Write a protein that binds this ligand. Sequence first.
Ligand SMILES: [Zn+2]
Ligand SMILES: [Zn+2]
Ligand SMILES: [Zn+2]
Length: 279
Amino acid sequence: MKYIGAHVSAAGGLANAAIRAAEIDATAFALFTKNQRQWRAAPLTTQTIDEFKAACEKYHYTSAQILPHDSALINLGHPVTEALEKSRDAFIDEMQRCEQLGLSLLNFHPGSHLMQISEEDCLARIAESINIALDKTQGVTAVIENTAGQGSNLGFKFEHLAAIIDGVEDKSRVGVCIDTCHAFAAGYDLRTPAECEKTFADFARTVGFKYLRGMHLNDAKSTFGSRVDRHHSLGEGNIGHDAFRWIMQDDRFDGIPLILETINPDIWAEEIAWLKAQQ
DNA sequence: ATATCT
DNA sequence: AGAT
DNA sequence: ATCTGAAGTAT
Ligand SMILES: [Zn+2]
Ligand SMILES: [Zn+2]
Ligand SMILES: [Zn+2]
């Protein structure tokens, strides 16, 4: 059983995310629990929480089918102490909002070294940030998303993900989400079934599927190994439709949120339908 | 710096 | 991308 | 149709 959806808008209230997901016949969904471009947000109200839970129940979205995404401002590997602490506090709040909403997963990008510290140093800070958040919360798994490798963003190599996991104390609450556009942009080919086999065997050897908690299904406007993060609708990008059919036919991607972050929301219902039909 | 993306 |  | 304000890619 596969859970297929998209990162829908939470405008007007978190419950609206569940409503919008149901509208496109999604069996999974992602969302921001607050403005992704602002540091502070009003505390969740009992009404917002209840309406969200009610909507999730009404449309059959269990926590295993929802993959919230954290703010874009957070840098869990920031080289400057003040900024690192600010990011950590915000991440803790993000995890706590998940707790309050009955969610069990939180997808986030690792962090960036900003050319001020070593890769190893940065990865260590990220692992510690996760350890701190896990010590302050319960029931929420920190899901590390791989990245395209733009600028000083880390997490573009599977080895980075493995290194962070190695530094996390409570292995039961850490995992990863693989974004196909990011992987492709970072140099992991997905243009043919054979390349997909190779790329995921690499993932298996380095990270291990036991840690896979979600997928972001995005084609790529950017090119192979370009290290540029630009999404595209399925089949219209440089990856092509083969990779997505392959993923839908592989049982290793069962029981986790498979999230579209494609650029034309007006065809999400159709993209979801197509993905389902590939199984 | 401006526009746009994630 | 969400609030106003 | 403007803020918010990390990090980054083009221009
Ligand atoms: Zn992401
Ligand atoms: Zn993504
Ligand atoms: Zn992306």
